[PDB]
Design a protein around this ligand. Structure first.
Ligand SMILES: CC(C)c1cnn2c(Nc3ccc(S(=O)(=O)N(C)C)cc3)cc(N[C@H]3CC[C@H](N)CC3)nc12
Length: 286
């Protein structure tokens, strides 16, 4: 730590608080995550150091000291939520939404081919820079270990996790990214639940209550109950206007109940939604 000069708090997570920091030594500006009070987490964390992609925030180093842990990261100036707020009156132009979705999928297709899942994608875990890039952030702090008790959002949790699946797949990240995708198009959260059952029931009211017809094995799931009310599905023509036909088709596949039929990032890269994909510069104001 004596290597670093704090600059400001940029964030706080379940895990640690995040400082903008400068190398007392090199002048290099970095982001410094502190995690408070072991062994396989170390190996885990260190396995991330290797997981480098243009669309994953780069983990520069791991300092382990006096039982405090610190991860030194590349620093980005803004997150997708703040950018999303700054766009609310007009919303993010479609070619920019498409570019972001496209880069995150490439991010995820890398993750996934290497067996790493993010587990917690959400607008504030996504960071942007002035050159049109969006990066998955704080990534694989999932199979790490466990200070504010500030509630985590459920809004992007995949239904298999809510139904108590222990062993869930890479498909949970796609569900999450599709939640974010629809949110970018609409300027409102897709499934803004405020408890687990409420989060479940909001998915049900838009997507239909899942049964064995749409999701083989649904009813044998840990947290499934037959007494779940039976909601009818809606068309996404009503869920994400005015997303075009390609976009609605893509979102649909990213929001399949059955994780195993849910589109993979790889397949998602090949979807005609991305036929005309470009990389627009965003206006940022820092
Ligand atoms: C530790 C890594 C992954 C990193 C790199 N940059 N950065 C930032 N930068 C940042 C700066 C300003 C803003 S900003 O001006 O929009 N704004 C103030 C909102 C938002 C984010 C913020 C940040 N913090 C959150 C902490 C919680 C974690 N789950 C995701 C990362 N982390 C980072």
């Amino acid at each position: 730590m004596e290597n670093f000069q704090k600059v400001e708090k940029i964030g706080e997570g379940t895990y640690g608080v995040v400082y903008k920091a400068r190398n007392k030594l090199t002048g290099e500006v970095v982001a410094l995550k502190k995690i408070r009070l072991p062994s396989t987490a170390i190996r885990e964390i260190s396995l991330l150091k290797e997981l480098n992609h243009p669309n994953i925030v780069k983990l520069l180093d791991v300092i382990h000291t006096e039982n405090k842990l610190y991860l030194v990261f590349e620093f980005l100036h803004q997150d997708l939520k703040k950018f999303m707020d700054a766009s609310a009156l007009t919303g993010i132009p479609l070619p920019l939404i498409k570019s972001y979705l496209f880069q995150l999928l490439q991010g995820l297709a890398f993750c996934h081919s290497h067996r790493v899942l993010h587990r917690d994608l959400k607008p504030q875990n996504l960071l942007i820079n002035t050159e049109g890039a969006i990066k998955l952030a704080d990534f694989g702090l999932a199979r790490a270990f466990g200070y504010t008790h500030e509630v985590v959002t459920l809004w992007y949790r995949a239904p298999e996790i809510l139904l108590g699946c222990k062993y869930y797949s890479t498909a949970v990240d796609i569900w999450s990214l599709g939640c974010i995708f629809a949110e970018m198009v609409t300027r409102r959260a897709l499934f803004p639940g405020d408890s687990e059952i409420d989060q479940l029931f909001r998915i049900f009211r838009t997507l239909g209550t899942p049964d064995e017809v749409v999701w083989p094995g649904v009813t044998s799931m840990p947290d499934y109950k037959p007494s779940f009310p039976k909601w009818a599905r809606q068309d996404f023509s009503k869920v994400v206007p005015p997303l075009d036909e390609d976009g609605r088709s893509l979102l649909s596949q990213m929001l399949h109940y059955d994780p195993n039929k849910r589109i993979s990032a790889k397949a998602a890269l090949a979807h005609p939604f991305f036929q005309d994909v470009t990389k627009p510069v965003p206006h940022l104001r820092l």
